[PDB]
Symmetry: C3
Subunit: 228 residues, 3 copies
Amino acid sequence: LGVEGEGIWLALGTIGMLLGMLYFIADGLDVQDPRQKEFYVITILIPAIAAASYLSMFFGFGLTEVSLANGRVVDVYWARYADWLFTTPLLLLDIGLLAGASQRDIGALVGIDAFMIVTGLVATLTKVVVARYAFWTISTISMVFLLYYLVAVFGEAVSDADEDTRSTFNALRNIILVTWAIYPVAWLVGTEGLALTGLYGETLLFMVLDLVAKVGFGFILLRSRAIM
Amino acid sequence: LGVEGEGIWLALGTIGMLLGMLYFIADGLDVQDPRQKEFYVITILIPAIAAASYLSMFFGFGLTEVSLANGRVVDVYWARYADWLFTTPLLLLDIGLLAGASQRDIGALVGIDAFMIVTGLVATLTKVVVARYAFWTISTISMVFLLYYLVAVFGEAVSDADEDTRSTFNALRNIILVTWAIYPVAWLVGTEGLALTGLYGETLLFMVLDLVAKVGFGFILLRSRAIM
Amino acid sequence: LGVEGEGIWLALGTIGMLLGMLYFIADGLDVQDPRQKEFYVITILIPAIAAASYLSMFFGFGLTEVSLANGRVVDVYWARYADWLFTTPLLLLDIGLLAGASQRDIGALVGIDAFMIVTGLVATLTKVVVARYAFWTISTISMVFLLYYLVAVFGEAVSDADEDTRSTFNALRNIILVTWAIYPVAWLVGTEGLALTGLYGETLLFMVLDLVAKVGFGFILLRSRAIM
Ligand SMILES: CCCCCCCC/C=C\CCCCCCCC(=O)OC[C@@H](O)CO
Ligand SMILES: CCCCCCCC/C=C\CCCCCCCC(=O)OC[C@@H](O)CO
Ligand SMILES: CCCCCCCC/C=C\CCCCCCCC(=O)OC[C@@H](O)CO
Ligand SMILES: CCCCCCCC/C=C\CCCCCCCC(=O)OC[C@@H](O)CO
Ligand SMILES: CCCCCCCC/C=C\CCCCCCCC(=O)OC[C@@H](O)CO
Ligand SMILES: CCCCCCCC/C=C\CCCCCCCC(=O)OC[C@@H](O)CO
Ligand SMILES: CCCCCCCC/C=C\CCCCCCCC(=O)OC[C@@H](O)CO
Ligand SMILES: CCCCCCCC/C=C\CCCCCCCC(=O)OC[C@H](O)CO
Ligand SMILES: CCCCCCCC/C=C\CCCCCCCC(=O)OC[C@H](O)CO
Ligand SMILES: CCCCCCCC/C=C\CCCCCCCC(=O)OC[C@H](O)CO
Ligand SMILES: *C/C=C(C)/C=C/C=C(C)/C=C/C1=C(C)CCCC1(C)C
Ligand SMILES: *C/C=C(C)/C=C/C=C(C)/C=C/C1=C(C)CCCC1(C)C
Ligand SMILES: *C/C=C(C)/C=C/C=C(C)/C=C/C1=C(C)CCCC1(C)C
């Protein structure tokens, strides 16, 4: 149920993540090759983690209240950030391995990703209004950098690969660009920021984004000839 | 000492870990070879972390009350999980390096292990009784998988090694299989779950399990010809 | 602001870290080589993390009160530890990469570093006074070992390198030795320990130490011929 009806999206999110996970598992049963197997392992682990995170939220674990200096009280699902701290580096690993990026480049993006998620958690938890928006601005700046780097650095890495790999990379890159860019906007319009929509709407929006970014992304990756 | 006499097991456990650590250190003083030396470092770090966790719990810092949604109050040593989050992947690294497993395979197992421990911690901290059991179930399923994968995947990797190595692997594998499998049982029968035993018994059980899984395991590993 | 005027050192620390970060970014713009580039990425990420930590503290989010069994109430800037938990391994990685230390050796020091930071956080947060000093002692022991291993192990790794690299390594090593050894002394003399100085003096001291250990260190590294 949740605080303001948002439990329905928490439940549907749990289910959607679980089904993606099982589909991926079903799909990888015959995989023998180590590189290919690796893509399965990372891509199954992603919605496992998101499914468990969603379920914990559905049950109200991982839900806090933050009282701002405003007097405003904000209903903060902080378990999302726990989810994000691990699933976003894994997503970056997934596409970096696809791109054939070096270990040092993947590590650089993982470092900037972690920075983005943690500064976003500070934005979400801080009581001081100006600090909320300062950290949201820090985190978004880091996001813009991360995305530019994904395009330029992973794009360069993938440029000497075969056409199947370049086309799959471009698809996955565009999923990241479009869906990841919406998260900070969603934070800003939802209850953590300007409150233009309430918790129910914000929770719906993240559920859709997460599902696209994990199960949609995973679907496109795992069905590609590029990983075989 | 402690809430209901259980501090004695916290103290013995501290001392035990510390003793195992010191012995391990004393044992590796003349080791020059980097691979052999790596086994020492990992196997010394494990009881260090566990000794420090045990000491924190003995002094009460590793201990919190969790009030359930039915009114039951549960006395929770959450420091265990802090310990487990790091020591279980290090133990898996140890035996994986023994087995000659690939980087990919150790990483996969470590991902599943981390998943297991974190969903365990959720099981332990959540206020809703059905959630407690749901997460204990998710974590136990992950464990069964981890243990299956340890046997099939690390066993396959070690199958091409020399006889001493396979023998030491089999001994260490069986220590993991038997001792790790008892932990979900301990949780279920202890105060976190069905409360068949109290805090004193439950603490004794985890002390014995941890000592076997860390110092017993470490002893068997570091004395083998396989690592020299 | 802050508890007792110490926000001025939080503000100057923020600004100091940010300006170091910016300098380093501006300094790395033309870098083509992957190894040189990696040194820039690490050394930019360090003061970015420290600037975000300092700003969070400046706004009051990286601060909590702790009531000791003493009755004494300590104003704890816990976000320092979050910072240190990531920045001290990255510093070790930086110098390790400079030393040409093996992956094993770097991982071993990062292990012991993490142990040192975590046990220091336990020291800072525990209410039982004897426990606070016991953990401070454990953490300091780990630090002395870490510093020794830095000198012996990383010094041996760098002993076959060219003169510029050896000379840069010795400068950076000496920065670590003097500055890092002072942190436990600040904790001891500051409000967490003997309270010989109040929060304002202690905050000032950590600001100075952090700026030398991150921006001073970074400056010396990134201007060296060794990394080119
Ligand atoms: C309602 C939340 C449910 C969350 C998931 C619970 C069940 C899963 C529990 C643990 C799994 C964690 C991730 C485990 C990831 C396993 C990946 C694997 O080994 O697959 C190999 C492929 O080739 C197979 O096709
Ligand atoms: C939620 C955070 C969980 C962190 C778990 C602790 C992480 C640190 C402890 C162990 C990490 C080891 C697993 C990381 C993967 C190590 C694989 C490896 O070392 O391969 C060696 C040779 O086979 C090839 O050169
Ligand atoms: C309330 C949140 C509940 C969910 C928390 C999730 C905790 C994190 C779980 C899993 C983290 C997995 C980290 C481990 C990820 C391993 C990635 C891997 O397979 O690397 C392969 C390389 O070594 C070789 O190419
Ligand atoms: C005011 C609080 C502090 C806010 C700092 C926010 C900084 C966010 C921007 C980036 C995140 C830091 C991680 C940045 C790590 C990558 C930097 C890089 O690749 O530089 C290229 C080199 O060649 C140098 O030119
Ligand atoms: C009270 C709780 C205290 C918890 C403190 C946790 C500190 C330990 C954290 C991480 C330890 C793992 C880091 C060190 C893990 C070993 C690194 C290594 O040897 O890797 C490469 C090789 O495998 C290549 O063959
Ligand atoms: C509750 C948290 C307890 C502490 C866990 C944190 C442990 C440290 C976490 C992140 C450290 C990242 C810094 C960088 C870690 C570098 C890992 C490494 O061994 O690389 C060596 C190779 O590059 C050599 O060629
Ligand atoms: C009142 C307490 C004050 C703080 C006490 C602890 C502060 C740290 C003290 C000393 C830090 C450095 C000690 C360890 C660093 C020296 C190790 C060394 O010299 O090795 C040389 C060999 O490798 C040559 O081949
Ligand atoms: C408020 C506190 C916020 C704290 C948030 C901390 C987030 C970052 C932590 C660890 C990232 C470590 C990532 C490892 C960095 C390696 C970078 C690298 O190897 O780059 C090579 C370069 O790209 C090519 O030459
Ligand atoms: C009572 C609580 C005690 C808690 C712990 C007390 C302090 C332990 C010191 C460092 C932590 C462990 C770090 C170990 C790092 C590896 C050390 C090593 O390299 O040992 C080599 C071995 O002898 C083969 O040569
Ligand atoms: C109440 C219950 C609480 C939880 C109890 C959990 C017990 C799990 C222990 C062992 C099963 C998993 C490990 C063994 C499963 C695989 C055995 C096997 O046949 O592996 C053969 C291998 O594939 C040949 O190469
Ligand atoms: C599977 C989950 C995904 C891919 C989530 C990605 C999340 C982000 C890109 C988060 C972005 C944020 C900002 C850049 C500003 C601060 C608010 C955040 C954390 C929502
Ligand atoms: C050194 C510590 C060791 C080897 C501890 C291992 C711990 C586990 C195998 C924990 C298992 C659990 C379950 C599978 C269900 C949920 C409760 C746990 C975390 C106790
Ligand atoms: C950039 C930040 C740096 C380099 C911080 C270093 C911090 C330490 C060396 C910490 C030392 C501590 C002890 C050894 C005893 C416990 C108190 C600590 C955590 C301050």
